[PDB]
UniProtKB/Swiss-Prot annotation, chains A, B, C:
Misc. remarks from the entry: The enzyme contains a high proportion of positively-charged residues in beta-barrels V and VII (compared to the homologous regions in other triose isomerase sequences). Since 2 clusters of positive charges located at precise distances on the molecular surface are common to 4 glycosomal enzymes, it has been speculated that this might represent a signal for entry into glycosomes.
Active site: H86 (electrophile), E158 (proton acceptor)
Name of this protein: Triosephosphate isomerase, glycosomal
Family, similarity comment: Belongs to the triosephosphate isomerase family.
Reaction equations catalysed: D-glyceraldehyde 3-phosphate = dihydroxyacetone phosphate
Amino acid sequence: SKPQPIAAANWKSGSPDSLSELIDLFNSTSINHDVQCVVASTFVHLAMTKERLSHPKFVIAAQNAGNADALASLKDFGVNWIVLGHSERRWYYGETNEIVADKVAAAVASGFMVIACIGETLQERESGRTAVVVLTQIAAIAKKLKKADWAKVVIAYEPVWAIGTGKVATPQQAQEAHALIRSWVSSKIGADVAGELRILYGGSVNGKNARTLYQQRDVNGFLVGLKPEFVDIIKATQ
Amino acid sequence: SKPQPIAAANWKSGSPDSLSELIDLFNSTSINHDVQCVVASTFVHLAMTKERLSHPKFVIAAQNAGNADALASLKDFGVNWIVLGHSERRWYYGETNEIVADKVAAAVASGFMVIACIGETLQERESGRTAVVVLTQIAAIAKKLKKADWAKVVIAYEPVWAIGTGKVATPQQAQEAHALIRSWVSSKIGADVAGELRILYGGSVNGKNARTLYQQRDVNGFLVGLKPEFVDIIKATQ
Amino acid sequence: SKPQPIAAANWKSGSPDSLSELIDLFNSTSINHDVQCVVASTFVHLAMTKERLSHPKFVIAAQNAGNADALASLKDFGVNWIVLGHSERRWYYGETNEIVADKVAAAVASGFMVIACIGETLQERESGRTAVVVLTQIAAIAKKLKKADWAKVVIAYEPVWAIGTGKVATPQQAQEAHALIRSWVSSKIGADVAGELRILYGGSVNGKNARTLYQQRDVNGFLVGLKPEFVDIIKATQ
């Protein structure tokens, strides 16, 4: 019943050696279930990742593409995945709902698989606005898409409200949010689309609480930071 | 006598683990005098610093806010300090005196404590224009502020004449610059504001010059790189 | 005969300490032959490298430019060399042949020594367009220069087609690229300019491969990653 899960991890910082070491680890990870793993890299590290990463269940993603030429350069380089709408961009780089929506449509048009992030802030959640905020964010994206395009879309629910707090969302809070999103998709886009849609939990987690989160009916994977424990996150989607 | 000193450290680069370990160091550091410690982060590291850093004498600062939305996201995230007009902004990104002044005024308006950086090049210094250059930079900032706003302002002198050319300024050179800045603030803004103003030294600081630098009449602390030796930089402000 | 070679290294990422240890290594290295060594980094690392680098055959470069208008201020900060037109900028940051040309000319007029990167993609090489692409890129640069400016210019042939493939161009492949560039410079700019022009091999290479590459008639050095093995790259220009 659940579609194919996705485990996706973002580079933050550190030496080329620290990255090549992770790549070696992932190349040597035997994964027995069907899962798409995604290593989202910064531009400066795409060359080394393309050079060293080779695993049948791993693809490379970009974290950003600031112009049409960048998208085209990524595709020419064999990078077919991209992460869009992450809170860092929305918070600090002026990326409104509409800007994010336009980027998703552009990337889809270019033939990217897109992991599109949505999520409400602390202030938004506490004023009881989780539903309106998150559904407004996905509505904006859907505005610029056709029904067929959804096969190229993955949604990450980023519990922006929990960033920096040291607390993972309970499986109940995560399920509620993922459920909220799927219901909107089912009703506004299509029951077929909703069933096939991957909705990833984009809060940080360890392997233990990731397993429990994955037991939730509307959780289809994770978007986390790149580190050795990403192997545990992959296994959590079994 | 001197106002409360400030010891402020800037993240440069390295892995999330490296930052984590530094946070562990600072959390366990005993500080027995009145000093405001500041850790200036890049966006990507703000989440871990908020999550892990907890010392009564430490606050978190941003290094940039490129737009109005970014200032607001920072404030909502509980980031109440910002460093503006630092050498990268002025000499790589070309922020003019006016752009810096506008940023300082906007941040103050939004409730931030601002560390505003000023400093002259070797061409400026060697051609006898240290005073006109440095004081013109601060004059641009002052134009956009009211007298009451100075309680939310901190000045940092970055001797880019030395930094950019491989020199280490002496305590005498640091003092002369700080004294120039203080006399300007005294003259233009008020002797009250001048006596209360923190002017931090932002040149090359090591374990042997830190105390002599702090003991200069017009130095009120430091703007330096984040390193384990920051503990000793803090100690030098006692 | 061959002009003075250049050995240039780009710092990728990682902690200040890791870079500082490399600077220590470089400082203790005898380099007996006539060669200009270049260490290029992002802006944040300039302070440390300026402070600590002592080797008399090394200079410090900025890893790229921001806007062409901000090159003058970066010169005044104290940077004397710059790398422009690197594939990363052309691919991801919208730097067309003409934007690269404008930056090169602006850097020269501000008194920089410039390493200007040119090279064709895998798609361009496969389609038989190595010469047209590379010569179009260098033609654009030349259009904004005068003959006297070439004394301040260095070309890096970046084998962009090989990026991410883990393979180095063969000496035959590198020589062919460098020779067609020089041939164009000789005819279009001047024989003497072409004789004095340094054309660097701008792909990562190790000591042994570098030594064989440097044997080629039109190879005048290297633009590579900043790592311990950079000492062997320098030695390979003997």
